[PDB]
C-alpha cells in the first residue's frame, strides 16, 4: 500500500503502545519511528487505505491515556513522490 | 483495483478538477473520461475499496463549485463481472 | 525555481501533511525537512514565485489543524546567495 498513517505522541511509551495497536489491528507495516525532538515521537505505518484508517484509529485509541498522550493521528492516502523522500522506508 | 468511482459533472472543466482531486487524494487510476453528451462528462477511477471511497469524496468536494458543478458522485466497491464490459479500461 | 517557501510546524505529523499539501498544490521541490529542536520541524520547498505562493498557502491551510499545528509559513521570492549556504539543497 501507499497510504501513510502517522501517530505523534509525547514520549516513546505512548508511541510504542500506539505502534503495537496499529500493527496488530490492521495489515499495515511500521515503516519507522522518528524522534522529532522536544519530547515528541512519531510512529509512521504504510498499507492499503482502509487498513491504514483502521490502524491509525486503533492506535490513537490505545495511546490517548498512555503517558503524556497523543498529539496527532493523521492518514495521507497517497503521499506525493517528493514527500516519499522525507518518509522512513523501514524502522532502524 | 476492483472498486469504481464515477464523478459526473456538467462541463469538462469541472471534470478535470474532479479528476485532479481524486487521483491526488488516493491511489486510484483514471480509467476513462466519457463525454456522455448534453454537457455531461463522467470521470471513472478504479482502485482499492478504501482508495476509491477517499478519491470520490475528494473529487466531489473539489468539482462542486467549479463550473456548472457536480451531477452525481458514486462508488461501486465491486461491479458485477458483466458491467466490467461496459466500463472503460484506460483513458483516451 | 529560486523562491523559497517554508512551513514550520510543531511535530513531523503536522509537517509531513504540510509537505504533501505544498508539493501536491504546485510545481515546487521539497528541498529539506529539518528537526530545529524543541518540537519544531521546518519543511522548505523551492520553485518559481507563483508556485511557492500556491504551495505555502496550501501547506498552511492543510497543517493548521493537524497535531499541534503551524508555527509559521513564509515565502522568500529571491534569497541572497549568502543565505543559500544555510538552506538545504535536497532532503536528508
Amino acid at each position: 500500500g501507499i497510504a501513510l498513517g502517522m501517530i505523534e505522541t509525547r514520549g516513546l511509551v505512548p508511541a510504542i503502545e500506539a505502534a503495537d495497536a496499529m500493527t496488530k489491528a490492521a495489515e499495515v507495516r511500521l515503516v519507522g519511528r522518528q524522534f522529532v525532538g522536544g519530547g515528541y515521537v512519531t510512529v509512521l505505518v504504510r498499507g492499503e487505505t482502509g487498513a491504514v484508517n483502521a490502524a491509525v484509529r486503533a492506535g490513537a485509541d490505545a495511546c490517548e491515556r498512555v503517558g503524556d498522550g497523543l498529539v496527532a493521528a493523521h492518514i495521507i492516502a497517497r503521499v506525493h513522490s517528493e514527500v516519499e523522500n522525507i518518509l522512513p522506508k523501514a524502522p532502524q | 483495483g476492483i472498486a469504481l468511482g464515477m464523478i459526473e459533472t456538467r462541463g469538462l472543466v469541472p471534470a478535470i478538477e474532479a479528476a485532479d482531486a481524486m487521483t491526488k487524494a488516493a491511489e486510484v487510476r483514471l480509467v476513462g473520461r466519457q463525454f456522455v453528451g448534453g454537457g455531461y462528462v463522467t470521470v471513472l477511477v478504479r482502485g482499492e475499496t478504501g482508495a476509491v471511497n477517499a478519491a470520490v469524496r475528494a473529487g466531489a468536494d473539489a468539482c462542486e463549485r467549479v463550473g456548472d458543478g457536480l451531477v452525481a458522485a458514486h462508488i461501486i466497491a465491486r461491479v458485477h463481472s458483466e458491467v466490467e464490459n461496459i466500463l472503460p479500461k484506460a483513458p483516451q | 525555481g529560486i523562491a523559497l517557501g517554508m512551513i514550520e510546524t510543531r511535530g513531523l505529523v503536522p509537517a509531513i501533511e504540510a509537505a504533501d499539501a505544498m508539493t501536491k498544490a504546485a510545481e515546487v521541490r521539497l528541498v529539506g525537512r529539518q528537526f530545529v529542536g524543541g518540537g519544531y520541524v521546518t519543511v522548505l520547498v523551492r520553485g518559481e514565485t507563483g508556485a511557492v505562493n500556491a504551495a505555502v498557502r496550501a501547506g498552511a491551510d492543510a497543517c493548521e489543524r493537524v497535531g499541534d499545528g503551524l508555527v509559521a509559513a513564509h515565502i522568500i521570492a529571491r534569497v541572497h546567495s549568502e543565505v543559500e549556504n544555510i538552506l538545504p539543497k535536497a532532503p536528508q
Binding site: 492506535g59 490513537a60 490517548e64 | 488516493a26 477517499a54 470520490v56 469524496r57 475528494a58 | 501533511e17
Partner: peptide, 20 residues
C-alpha cells in the same frame, strides 16, 4: 451500528476523509 476498528477514535483521526 457496525462495530470494528473504524468505530475507534471517532474525533481524533484527521486527514483523508472518506465518502459520507
Amino acid at each position: 451500528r457496525i462495530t470494528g476498528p473504524g468505530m475507534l477514535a471517532t474525533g481524533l483521526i484527521t486527514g483523508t476523509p472518506e465518502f459520507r
